[PDB]
Design a protein around this ligand. Structure first.
Ligand SMILES: [Zn+2]
Ligand SMILES: [Zn+2]
Ligand SMILES: [Zn+2]
Lengths: 168, 144, 87, 94, 65, 118, 49, 107, 56, 196
DNA sequence: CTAGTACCTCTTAAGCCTCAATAAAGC
DNA sequence: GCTTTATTGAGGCTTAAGCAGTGGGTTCCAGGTACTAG
């Protein structure tokens, strides 16, 4: 319903504002890096954690919005298949796209895509998708999701052979 | 940690510092080969203070290392401990003096006792000297 | 006339590209659109959907579908039985 | 005169027949697979095959980095169209 | 420490010793007994000593010393 | 600071004159000798604050790629600026940004606690 | 090397757009490195915009 | 039992076998600073007599090589000074069973 | 102690994804990898270097 | 509807799949694993763009890891197994003065880090001061029953003219372009090593 | 003359050899 | 006191390993050359 979408959008906006504030604090060297972990890695971990928390909150809001009459929710409760992540991505938010255990790297010169200027660490430019499959994905979000899917496919294709060799 | 000391965070950080591997590379901001014509007089007017406290024979070469105060505070490293470690590693080959921590700028002066091998000696003293910790240790993180 | 220019991989590193002709230049159902933070946009895409290949373009609403499913559909489309030529 | 024309015609025919792209038939490092039988299961399949790209890197190995599509592929290589399996991440379609 | 020789025309009969401390390259053949000495650098190699010996032999033969 | 002979266009090795107790730059190829202006011989700069602001040119602000910003310039109070990050790439480099003003081509750090000329 | 990279790059772009030079040629100017690269070799993938 | 501070020269190592009837074991000061047996991972090791070894072999019907092997230089073997052909019983605590008794024979 | 550490690491890696395997299988695996004097890696340089049947 | 774009061989329709290759005439700088002594290697696959194409993989390697105290750079000249210091190559080209070599390698004299890193290189290359000596040293390796002083200096000069950076030119009229290109390659390698 | 017939053409695990110090025995 | 030893180990090069099963379509019957039988 409309109220649920409005609440999800508000939560996403709050998460984006928090990420922007954290980035501004980091730029002014006002953020204390975690012990051992470097400043860049600490900032990336904090941003990823915030985005994951926002996505989880949006998924929880969607799930509570859905009623027992909902078919997807009923199937998930049955335990046949699906999970919280599936409902969240289908109705609330796809979430951050991780490649090699990290956000989308600057493939170009300090630019993830040509559509973004150099030194753009905002979530939208770092693989984050703020639109569920229902509404659709923007071309940048689509490309990031494609990169994530390619990474997953390659990982499966290599790990199947590795596991077979180990089992042998 | 031991059950008695497992409830104290100060003891945990003390143990972490004791076992954490500390090297001059992490703390040393820079190292330069300055020239000191005489021990009594220094080319840098501000450097004289280092020998002033000494007032209150040696080769005409100087090696000046500038460190990071923030790194010292974070790692709890102190000038006295590193000086003692250097003296232990080098009994009398090189004379080393360090400024008091209270000074705004902290530097260390090392000079070979009575130039071609000076670079090699400096490289060995930087890379092959450990202030404290255990070899083959990168970082130690405490957790609850 | 210079209305359309060819750009290679190397040149893309030194240009900013707008998503739509009139979106970046100037009912919560429409997908969220990234704000036009920049103001230069020396170039722009004729249409984003053209990034898709021959098989991918056949997929209806590829964005609405997960990327692995799109890849599977692209692989499977080559095996679909249908009229390949009129002769 | 006395030019052996077959030397060129037969060589080209062999190169386009088995896909062995080499200076001579005896060569074992000809990097086969350059030429492939055009697929005509459906018109879309033929179009995709005609616009297909191949990577000389061996299909074996477990290095994911080359297989992953770089950000530079935007607008040049289809993000989704790609074979699944050993050839995944190596065979690309523009 | 194996190189060809020109006096006896025997291959692999030449041995070169490079004393970097004294910076001296000495070339000796185990068949004809010919011995040659030259100045060398830390980057010198036995091929350098062989080339120097060949150049010296050519200069001596030409008589343009 | 490192200089050359200025006559043969060659490097100068350092040497110590104990009789004069001085550091002198001279090349063994020739007889040229000079007295070092400053007592600088060796420097490694394990951590370097220079080189992060490199490549700046007069037409830097005209690059579309550089992201714009509306921060007021300290001197000319010009809102228009182009902001970028540290040029040097490292796993420990700070994320401090640098802003260049088109009107005066002045580079200033985003940090407010300390003001940096470059 | 060239002293006025901006003017040369603008002239090259204008000529390429007008059609005097083959559009397939790729010209890239990097201010950070202050380097101008021109590529005409075959096998280069390009798209229209 | 002889304990050294820094290291042992090879001359002493080759001289040690010079006395068959008397067995001499060399230990490092750093190695013995902390007792290994007190560790939780290491189970309880009990030396077995020749008669006990013979009885175990007879009951289980095993040969010398069928029993699990333990390195001569194993820290536990040095701690107990186990000799060649000597069987040691290891009592371990497990989740599946209250305790388990295994045996190991030096190679 | 090495066998116990190997078993604990095997259990941790197996349970990382949530999959559960009975303790007996892990115990047998660590025992076979440690039945010899040292730790016999599961490779052509480990158990395959033992004195088992030639055809095996 | 048929788009053609294939070859009819023995009736069978064969299509040639596009083959991906690393672009030539470009310097690519890659790091090396810690166990290997090399630190950074810059490679260029020079090849003629008009005819008589042949692969010329020229690689310049910086020996010595971080803190090794040996910051030396050696370029693997084609047909020369033993890597030669860049100083000897510059001397052979014609840039004998050390200052000229440094200026070609480093454009901005203000940056003293590059000069400090290159100091060992010039220190080790100081032995060579003549073009003939540099050519002879280059020709030392890969002996094929020849006399270094007799019809080998010309052979080494021809190799340096053709084998070394064939793409930039194939004539001896202007050999300074090769020196400038080598200096640019070394500058890129040093920039990559310094992490800038 | 013409056409058969054969004939020359990417990530580790162990093994081994090759290297640079080091304490004892010769003398 | 000086000289020559066996030992120690440390890396380079090398030879190995590289999910399982299944369906199908293409191409090889090899090039020229000399010597000799009908
Ligand atoms: Zn001889
Ligand atoms: Zn001079
Ligand atoms: Zn301004």
């Amino acid at each position: 319903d409309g109220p649920t979408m409005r609440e999800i959008t508000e939560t996403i906006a709050e998460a984006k504002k928090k990420v922007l504030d954290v980035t501004k604090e980091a730029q002014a060297n006002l953020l204390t890096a975690k012990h051992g972990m470097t400043l860049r890695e600490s900032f990336e971990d904090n941003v990823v954690r915030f985005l994951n928390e926002a996505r989880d909150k949006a998924g929880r809001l969607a799930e509570v919005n859905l009623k027992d009459l909902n078919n997807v929710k009923q199937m998930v409760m049955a335990g046949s298949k699906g999970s919280f992540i599936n409902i969240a991505q289908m109705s609330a938010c796809v979430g951050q796209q991780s490649v090699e255990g990290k956000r989308i790297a600057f493939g170009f010169v300090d630019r993830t895509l040509p559509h973004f200027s150099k030194d753009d660490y905002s979530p939208e430019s770092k693989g984050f998708v703020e639109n569920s499959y229902l509404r659709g994905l923007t071309p940048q979000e689509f490309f990031f999701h494609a990169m994530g899917g390619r990474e997953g496919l390659i990982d499966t294709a290599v790990k199947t052979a590795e596991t077979g060799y180990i089992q042998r | 940690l031991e059950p008695g000391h497992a409830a104290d965070q100060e003891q945990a950080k003390l143990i972490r510092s004791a076992i954490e591997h500390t090297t001059l590379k992490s703390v040393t901001i820079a190292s330069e080969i300055y020239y000191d014509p005489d021990p009594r007089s220094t080319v840098i007017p501000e450097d004289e203070e280092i020998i002033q406290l000494h007032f209150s024979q040696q080769s005409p070469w100087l090696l000046r290392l500038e460190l990071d105060r923030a790194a010292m505070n974070d790692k709890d490293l102190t000038m006295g401990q590193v000086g003692e470690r250097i003296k232990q590693t080098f009994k009398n080959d090189l004379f080393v003096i360090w400024s008091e921590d209270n000074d705004e700028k902290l530097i260390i002066r090392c000079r070979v006792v009575r130039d071609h091998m000076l670079k090699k000696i400096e490289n060995t003293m930087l890379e092959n000297i450990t202030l404290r910790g255990v070899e083959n240790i990168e970082r130690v993180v405490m957790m609850k | 006339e210079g209305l359309v220019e060819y750009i290679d991989a190397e040149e893309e590193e030194s240009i900013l590209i707008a998503m739509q002709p009139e979106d970046l230049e100037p009912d919560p159902a429409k997908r969220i659109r990234v704000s036009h933070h920049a103001t230069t946009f020396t170039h722009c895409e004729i249409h984003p959907s053209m990034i898709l290949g021959v098989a991918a373009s056949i997929i209806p609403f590829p964005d609405h579908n997960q990327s692995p499913r799109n890849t599977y559909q692209s692989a499977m489309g080559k095996q679909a039985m249908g009229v390949f030529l009129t002769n | 005169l006395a030019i052996n024309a077959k030397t060129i015609t037969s060589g080209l025919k062999y190169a386009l027949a088995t896909g062995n792209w080499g200076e001579q038939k005896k060569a074992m490092s000809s990097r086969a697979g350059v030429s492939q039988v055009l697929n005509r299961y459906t018109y879309s399949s033929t179009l995709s095959h005609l616009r297909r790209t191949n990577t000389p890197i061996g299909r074996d190995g477990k290095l994911a980095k080359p297989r992953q599509l770089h950000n530079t592929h935007w607008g040049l290589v289809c993000p989704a169209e790609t074979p699944e399996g050993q050839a995944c991440g190596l065979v690309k379609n523009l | 420490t194996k190189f060809n020789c020109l006096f006896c025309n025997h291959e692999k009969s030449v041995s070169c010793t490079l004393d970097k401390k004294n910076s001296i390259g000495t070339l000796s053949c185990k068949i004809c007994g010919q011995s040659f000495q030259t100045r060398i650098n830390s980057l010198s190699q036995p091929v350098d000593v062989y080339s120097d010996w060949f150049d010296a032999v050519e200069e001596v033969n030409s008589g343009r010393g | 600071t490192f200089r050359f002979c200025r006559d043969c266009n060659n490097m100068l090795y350092p040497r110590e004159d104990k009789e004069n107790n001085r550091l002198l730059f001279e090349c063994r190829t020739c007889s040229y000798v000079e007295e070092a202006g400053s007592p600088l011989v060796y420097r490694h700069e394990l951590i370097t604050n220079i080189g992060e602001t490199a490549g700046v040119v007069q037409d830097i602000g005209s690059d579309p790629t550089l992201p714009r910003s509306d921060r007021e310039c300290p001197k000319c109070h010009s809102r228009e600026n182009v902001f970028f990050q540290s040029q040097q790439r490292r796993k420990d480099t700070s994320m401090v940004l640098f802003f260049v003003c088109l009107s005066c081509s002045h580079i200033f750090t985003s940090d407010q606690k300390n003001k940096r000329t470059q | 090397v060239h002293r006025n990279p901006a003017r040369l790059m603008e002239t090259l772009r204008t000529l390429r757009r007008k059609g005097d030079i083959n559009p397939e040629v790729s010209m890239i100017r990097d201010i950070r490195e202050k380097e101008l690269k021109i590529f005409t070799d075959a096998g280069r993938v390009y798209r229209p915009l | 039992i002889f304990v050294y501070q820094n290291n042992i020269t090879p001359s002493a190592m080759k001289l040690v076998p010079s006395i068959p009837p008397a067995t001499i074991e060399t230990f490092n000061e750093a190695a013995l600073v902390v007792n290994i047996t007190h560790h939780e991972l290491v189970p309880k090791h009990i030396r077995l007599s020749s008669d006990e070894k013979r009885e175990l072999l007879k009951r289980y019907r095993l040969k010398e090589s069928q029993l699990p092997r333990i390195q001569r230089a194993d820290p536990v073997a040095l701690y107990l000074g186990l000799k060649r052909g000597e069987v040691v019983k290891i009592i371990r605590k497990s989740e599946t069973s209250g305790r388990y008794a295994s045996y190991r024979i030096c190679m | 102690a090495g066998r116990a550490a190997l078993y604990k690491e095997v259990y941790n890696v197996i349970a990382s994804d949530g999959s559960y395997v009975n303790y007996r299988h892990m115990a047998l695996l660590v025992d076979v990898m440690t039945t010899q004097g040292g730790l016999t890696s599961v490779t052509r340089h480990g158990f395959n270097r033992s004195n088992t049947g030639a055809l095996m | 509807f048929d788009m053609g774009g294939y070859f009819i061989i023995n009736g069978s329709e064969k299509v040639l799949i596009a083959q991906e290759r690393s672009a030539g005439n470009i310097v690519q700088v890659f790091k090396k694993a810690a166990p290997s002594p090399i630190s950074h290697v810059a490679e260029i696959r020079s090849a003629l763009e008009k005819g008589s194409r042949f692969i010329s993989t020229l690689q310049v390697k910086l020996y010595g890891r971080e803190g090794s105290s040996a910051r030396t750079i050696k370029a693997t000249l084609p047909y020369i197994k033993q890597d030669i210091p860049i100083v000897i190559i510059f001397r052979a080209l014609g840039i004998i003065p050390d200052g000229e070599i440094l200026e070609h390698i480093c454009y901005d004299v203000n940056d003293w880090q590059m000069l400090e890193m290159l100091k060992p290189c010039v220190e080790d290359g100081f032995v060579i001061q003549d073009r003939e000596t540099a050519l002879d040293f280059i020709g030392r390796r890969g002996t094929a029953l020849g006399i270094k002083k007799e019809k080998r200096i010309q052979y080494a000069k021809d190799i340096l003219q053709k084998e070394f950076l064939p793409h930039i030119t194939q004539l001896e009229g202007f050999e300074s372009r090769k020196a400038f290109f080598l200096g640019y390659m070394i500058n890129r390698l040093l920039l990559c090593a310094l992490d800038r």
